[PDB]
Structure 1
Amino acid sequence: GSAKDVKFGADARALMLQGVDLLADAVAVTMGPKGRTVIIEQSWGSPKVTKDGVTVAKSIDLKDKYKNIGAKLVQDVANNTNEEAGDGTTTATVLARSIAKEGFEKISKGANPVEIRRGVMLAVDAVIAELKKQSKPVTTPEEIAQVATISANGDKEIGNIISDAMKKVGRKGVITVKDGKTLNDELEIIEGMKFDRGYISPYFINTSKGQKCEFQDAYVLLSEKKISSIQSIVPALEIANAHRKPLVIIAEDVDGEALSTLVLNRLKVGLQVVAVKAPGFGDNRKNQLKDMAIATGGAVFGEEGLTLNLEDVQPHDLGKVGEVIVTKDDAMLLKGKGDKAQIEKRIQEIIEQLDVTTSEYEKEKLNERLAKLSDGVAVLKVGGTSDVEVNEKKDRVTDALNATRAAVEEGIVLGGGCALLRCIPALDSLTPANEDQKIGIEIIKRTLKIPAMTIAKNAGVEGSLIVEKIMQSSSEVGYDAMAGDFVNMVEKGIIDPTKVVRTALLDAAGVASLLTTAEVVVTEIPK
C-alpha cells in the first residue's frame, strides 16, 4: 500500500549497475596476493578490518534504492558462495559484476534476455564440466599445506598449522578456530574424551600443584539421573574400597547427602573419589553419557529405557580408565577399557545418524561425539597484538580451513584464475541454439577472464596482457602475481579447490543472469 516509484528499461538498469559496480569495486580491491583491506565502521566499538569479500559485501547498503537492489543481489551472490564453500566470495562478486555488466550491454529491442540467461546457464554447465575434468584429487599433505597457504593470503605458518592439525585429527576431523591471548598461533590437540565440567567439590583435589584431581586406573560410575541419597552411592563406594581402586562419578548432579558422604570419606579416611557433572543439556547429554559408557566399558544408571538402579551395582557395571584428570572447569578421561568392537559399532551408529541429519547444528554435535570417540579435536588459537588484528587473521584462518576441507572433498585445480581461463576452449566448441544463447555463451566466455585480470590488476600490472600471455602459454603455466612471474602453478603451489571455483561461478551466474532479464524496477518512495 506504500507509494511506489517505477522505472523502465535502460535508466533502471544503469542505476542497478551503479549499485552493483560500487559494491564490486569495494570487494575487488581485496582479491589476490596483493589485495588490500577494507575498514568497516562498527557502531559499538572498534572498526573492522577485513580482506573477506562477503564481509565487505554485507556491510554495504545504499541510500538510492535502485542502486541498493543491485547491491542486495550481489550480496546474495557473496552470501550464497560463503554458505556453500566458505571461500571464493570475492571471485563470485567480480564474476557476478562482469555477467551483469555484459548482460546489460547486450539488451536491445530484438534481444530476448530470458534466452540469453539460458545460454549463460548452458555455458556455465559446460565450464563446470570442464572444471571437473581438470580437477585432481588431493593425495599429499604438502598439497593440504599449499591449499591452506594460498587461501590464507600466502601465510605459510597458517598453512603449516592447518596441515599439522589435519595430520593429527584427520582430514575430516574436527578443527575449531578461537581467540588466542598470545602473539603467535598455537595448535592444541585434545585427545581422549574431555568435557567442560569440573569437580563438583573443591575438596576432591589431590594434586595441589595444578589444583586438580588425578587418578590412575580408576573406576567410572555413570548415572543418567541425580545422585542424592545414601543408598544410591554407598554400594559403588563399597566396590571401590574393596577393590582398592579410585572411582569417578559422572552424573547429572551429585548433591545432598551423597555429596556429604563423598567429601567425608575423602577427607577422613582418604577415599580416592571425585564427582563430576555430566555435559550436555538434553538428549545430547544422554548420548555423550552412553558414549562414555561404551568407551570406558561401563553401564549407564537411572536410564529411562533399561531402568538400571544404583542400589544393585556389580563391579562389571563400572567403566575403567587408565587416567582421569579433573580440574575446576573440565574433566578428561584417558585410555578407557571398553570393548573395541562396541566402540566401532557406536562409531558407525554416529556415522549413520550423521547421514540422516540436515539441521546443521546436530551434525556438529555428532561430529564432536565421533571425534571424542575416535580421533580427538584440534583447536587453532589465533595470536595477535589487538582484537582487530586477531579478527582479521581469524577470517583468513577460517577461509583456509574451509578451502582445505573443500579441496579434500572435491580436489584441486590451478590457482590465480587460470582454471577458469583454461575452460574457454570448452565454450569455443559449443553450438548455440539461437542468437540469444550465443550472446549468453559469449558473455560467460568474456567473464571467464575476469578473476585473473582482477588478480593482475591488484598486483599493479596490466591484466589483459597477463591474461593473453597466459592463454598463449601451456596449460600448466599461469601468472604468479606475488612474484610477478609466469610459473608452473602446481609446482609453485598456487592451487585452488575445484568446489570453490565452481561454486563461485554458479552462484554468480544464476543471480546475475536473472538480474539481466529485468525491464521494470519497482521501489518504495523514500520517506
Structure 2
Amino acid sequence: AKDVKFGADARALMLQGVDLLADAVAVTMGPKGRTVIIEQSWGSPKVTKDGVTVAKSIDLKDKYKNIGAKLVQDVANNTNEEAGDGTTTATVLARSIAKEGFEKISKGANPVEIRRGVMLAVDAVIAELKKQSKPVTTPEEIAQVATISANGDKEIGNIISDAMKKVGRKGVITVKDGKTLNDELEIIEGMKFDRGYISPYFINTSKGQKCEFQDAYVLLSEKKISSIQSIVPALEIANAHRKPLVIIAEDVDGEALSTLVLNRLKVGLQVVAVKAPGFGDNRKNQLKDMAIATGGAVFGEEGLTLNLEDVQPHDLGKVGEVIVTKDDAMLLKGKGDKAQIEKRIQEIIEQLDVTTSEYEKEKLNERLAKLSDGVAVLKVGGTSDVEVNEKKDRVTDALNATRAAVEEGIVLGGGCALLRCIPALDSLTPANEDQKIGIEIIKRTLKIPAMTIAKNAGVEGSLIVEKIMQSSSEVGYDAMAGDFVNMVEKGIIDPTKVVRTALLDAAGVASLLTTAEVVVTEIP
C-alpha cells in the first residue's frame, strides 16, 4: 500500500537521510582521516578509514530517509566504478549543494532556476579546471606522478613508468603475484575487451569482486545463445578435457542465466559468460578475430556451416588465463598459431591503407592494436603472502591513479583545485534572480572539500580556506605536514579526471534532490 509524500516533505526527509550518510562519510576524508567502526554480524568489528565502505555499509530504516541515502550511494559509487577516488568528495559536495538548495527554496525560490544556475556554475568550473590542468606526457613526469601516487615510493613508480613506456599509455597493464623476491615486468601476448559480468554471482574469488581462472579453450559465436540445450553439449568437453573452457559468444537467453547460476552456485562450474565485444559488422570481425588469435572459429551463422551443438574439441583455442572483472574481460597468452596472427595483422595493416572515414579507421585500428601488441603483466614479488599481497594492492592503486592522471593531467591536491576554480568565475551572467542564487550556492560549496580535509586534521577549516584563498596560485595547505607548501615542490596532486567526475556527479544528484516533487514509497 504505497505511501505518497508531496513536495517539501519528501525533500526534507530525503535530505535528512543524505545528511546522515554524508556526516558519516565526510569524517574519513583527507590524509588525516578518522576511523569508523562498522560492526559486523558474525565476527569482530571492521575498523575502516576509507569513505567507500562506510557508504556501502550505511542503510537507514525510515523509507523516505533511505531514499536520500540510496541516491547518493548509487551516484558516488558509480563514480568509484568509473575510477578510484572521490566517492567521498562527491557525497560531501552533493550534501552541501542539496542542503543549501533546500534552504534557499524554503525562502520562496524556484527549483528549476536554482538548478539552472547551479548547472551554469558547474559547467563554468569544469571549464576552468580543464584550463588549469597540467598534463603529464613525457616518460619522466609519468614516473614522478607514479611515485607521488605510490606515497613517495620509487621502485613502484619506476616499474609503473617503465611498463607505461613499454606498452604505451593507451595500452593494457595488469598486476599479478610474483614467485620471487623483487618485482619485474614481462610483456606477453594477449588482449582485453570491454565486456563484463552478466550476473554478480559468476565471480570466482570473492576477493576484490573478480572472476579469475587458468588455462582454457575458447569458443565464440556471432549469434545469441538462445537455449540451454545449446549449452548441454558445452560443459560436455569441460570436464572431459581437463580445461575449464571459455565461451564468449553473445547474450545468453535468460534461461541459461538462471540455469548457470543453479549449476555453478553451490555446484561450481568453470565456464565463462561474457557478452559480445562491439556492435554489428565490426563485432563479427572481432569475434572471428578472437577466434583466429586463439585457434578456433565463431560458432554462429556463416558460410562454412559450423554450429556449436556438436561437441568438437578439435582446435578451439590456446589461451592462458581469463580474468572477468565487473566491466572488463582479459584473454591472456594466446598462441593459437603463429601464421594466422601475423597474417591477420597484415590484413588489417593493408585495409588501413584505404583512406576511409574517421570511424572505420579507429574501429579497425583497435583490432590492429589488440592483435599486434599485448598486455604487460606486472609480476610483483616480496619477502610472504602478506608482503606481496599488500604490495600488489599498493601498486594497483598507484597504477590506477597514474593512469587516471595521464588522460586529463593533474591539479593541486588536498582539495585546493576547486578552491582555485572559485575566484576565476565570478564573471558569470545570471539571467533570472534564482540563477544567481544557484551560482552563490556553488561558489559556497566549492570550498567544502578543503574545509573538511582541514577540519579532519584538526585546525579550524575557515582560517585555512581563507589563507589559501588569499595565498598565491600554487601554495596549498598540506594536512600531513601542517604548513602551506606547494604543488610542484611538495608533490601532493589529484588527477583532474577525479575532481571533474566528483563535481559532475555531485551536481547531478544534488539537482535531483533539490527538485524531487512527490516521492512514492511502499508502506512497511
TM-score, with structure 2 as normaliser = 0.64
Distance across 1 between alignment mates of 2:172 and 2:195: 20
- Alpha carbons of structure 1 residues 384 and 20: separation in structure 2 relative to 1, 3 Å: farther
**Bigger shift: 330-339 or 482-491?**
330-339
CA-to-partner distance for each residue in 1:445-481, whole Å, 9 max, x for gaps?
0111011112212222222211111111111111122
Report the count of equivalent residues: 524
- Residues 6 and 518 in structure 2, CA contact (< 8 A), matched pair in contact too: yes
Name the SS for the 2:382 alignment partner.
coil
- Change beyond 3 A, Cα 1:142–1:315: same
Change over 3 Å in CA distance of 1:198–1:519 after alignment to 2:
closer
- Does the aligned pair in 2 maintain the 1:33–1:153 contact within 8 Å? no
* Structure 1 residues 501 and 311: alpha-carbon distance in aligned structure 2, compared to 1, 3 A threshold: closer
Structure 2 residues without counterparts, runs of 5 or longer: none
Distance 1:256 1:468, change over 3 A: closer
Contact 2:191 2:371 in 1 (8 A): yes
How far does the alpha carbon of each residue in 1:105-161 deviate from its partner, in whole angstroms, 9 at most, with x for none? 211253101110111000000001111111122123443344445555666654444
1:426 deviates by 3.0
Residues 92 and 240 of structure 1, relative CA distance in 2, 3 Å threshold: closer
Deviations along 1:288-311, one digit per CA (max 9) or x if unpaired, are: 999799999999999987999999
Q: Which has the larger radius of gyration?
A: 1
CA distance in 2, matches of 1:301, 1:111: 61
Q: How does 1:101-500 map to 2 (within 5 A)?
A: 101-108=99-106, 110-151=108-149, 158-178=156-176, 189-190=187-188, 346=344, 373-380=371-378, 397-500=395-498
More deviation in 276-285 or 373-382?
A: 276-285
Range with bigger deviation, 26-35 or 180-189: 180-189
- Report how far residue 406 of structure 1 moved: 2.4
User: Counterparts of 1:317 and 1:248 in 2: how far apart (Å)?
Assistant: 13
**Further displaced range: 297-306 or 145-154:** 297-306
Whole-Å separation in 2 of the counterparts to 1:268 and 1:502:
43
Deviation at 1:174, TM superposition (A): 1.2
CA distance in 2, matches of 1:399, 1:210: 13
Does the 8 Å contact 1:197/1:276 carry over to 2? yes
Deviates more, 1:86-95 or 1:353-362: 353-362
Give the direction of change, closer, same or farther, for the CA distance of 1:386–1:522 in structure 2 (3 Å limit): farther
Deviation at residue 177 of structure 1 after TM alignment? 3.6
Please say if residues 227 and 252 of structure 2, whose CA atoms lie closer than 8 Å, have aligned partners that are also in contact.
Answer: no
Task: List alignment gaps of at least 5 residues for structure 1.
Answer: none
Cα distance in 2 for residues equivalent to 1:517 and 1:477: 38
Q: Distance in 2 between matches of 1:211 and 1:115?
A: 42
In the TM superposition, residue 10 of structure 1 has moved relative to its aligned partner by 4.9
Partner of 2:187: helix, strand, or coil? Answer: strand
Provide Cα deviations, 1:4-38, integer angstroms capped at 9, x if missing partner: 33345555434322221222223223322222455
Gap change, CA 1:437 and 1:367, over 3 Å in 2: same
Deviations 1:34-61 (A, max 9, x none): 2245565667888766555344323321
Structure 1 residues 138 and 304: alpha-carbon distance in aligned structure 2, compared to 1, 3 A threshold: same
Deviations 1:158-194 (A, max 9, x none): 4444333323333222112456688987655546999
Q: Does the CA-based 8 Å contact 2:414-2:453 persist in structure 1?
A: yes
CA contact (8 A) 1:427 1:441 kept: no
Secondary structure (helix, strand or coil) at the match of 1:70 reads helix
- Taking every aligned residue pair, what percent have the same amino acid on both sides? 100
User: How far, CA to CA, are the matches of 1:435 and 1:202 in structure 2?
Assistant: 48
What secondary structure is seen at the aligned counterpart in 1 of 2:320? strand
Range with bigger deviation, 268-277 or 461-470: 268-277
- Most deviating of 305-314 and 133-142: 305-314
- Whole-Å separation in 1 of the counterparts to 2:207 and 2:61: 61
Q: Report if the CA contact (8 A) 1:174-1:371 is conserved.
A: no
Given that 2:348 and 2:368 are in contact with CA atoms closer than 8 Å, whether structure 1 keeps it comes out as yes
1:267-307 residue CA offsets vs partner (Å, 9 max, x unmatched): 99999999999999999999899979999999999998799
Q: Secondary structure at the match of 1:163?
A: helix
The alpha-carbon distance between structure 1 residues 233 and 413, as it changes in their structure 2 partners (threshold 3 A), is closer
C-alpha deviation, 1:90, in angstroms: 1.6
Q: Give the conservation status (yes or no) of the 8 Å contact 2:17–2:68.
A: yes
Tell me how far apart the structure 2 counterparts of residues 464 and 59 of structure 1 sit (CA, whole Å): 31
Identify if the C-alpha distance between structure 1 residues 213 and 55 changes in structure 2 by more than 3 Å, giving closer, same or farther.
Answer: closer
More strand by share: 1
Root-mean-square deviation over aligned CA pairs? 11.7
Q: 1:220 to 1:162 in 2, by over 3 A?
A: closer
Query: Alpha carbons of 1:352 and 1:508: their partners in 2 closer, same or farther (altered >3 Å)?
Result: farther
Q: Distance in 1 between matches of 2:311 and 2:196?
A: 25
CA contact (8 A) 1:227 1:251 kept: yes
Q: Any conservation in 1 of the 2:28–2:34 contact (CA below 8 Å)? A: yes
State whether residues 50 and 395 of structure 1, in contact with CA within 8 Å, keep that contact through their aligned partners in structure 2: no
Distance 1:159 1:241, change over 3 A: closer
Q: Greater CA deviation, 92-101 or 188-197?
A: 188-197
Does the Cα contact within 8 Å between 2:14 and 2:513 map onto a contact in 1?
A: no
Cα distance in 2 for residues equivalent to 1:218 and 1:93:
42
Task: Give me the TM-score of the superposition, normalised by structure 1.
Answer: 0.64
Give the superposition deviation at 1:329. Answer: 26
Aligned CA distance change for structure 1 residues 129 and 274 (closer, same or farther; 3 Å): closer
Q: 1:354 to 1:58 in 2, by over 3 A?
A: farther
Question: 1:126 and 1:378, CA in 2 relative to 1: closer, same or farther beyond 3 A?
Answer: same
Over 3 Å counting, the alpha-carbon distance change for 1:392 and 1:219 in structure 2 is closer
SS at match of 1:413: strand
Alpha carbons of structure 1 residues 288 and 346: separation in structure 2 relative to 1, 3 Å: same
Stretch moving more, 74-83 or 275-284: 275-284
The SS at the match of 1:255 is coil
- Whether the aligned pair in 1 keeps the contact of 2:189 and 2:334 (CA below 8 Å) is no
Cα deviation, 1:77-111, whole Å, max 9, x if unaligned, reads 21231233333222111111111111122112531
The structure-2 alpha-carbon separation of the partners of 1:142 and 1:303, relative to structure 1 and needing over 3 Å to count, comes to same
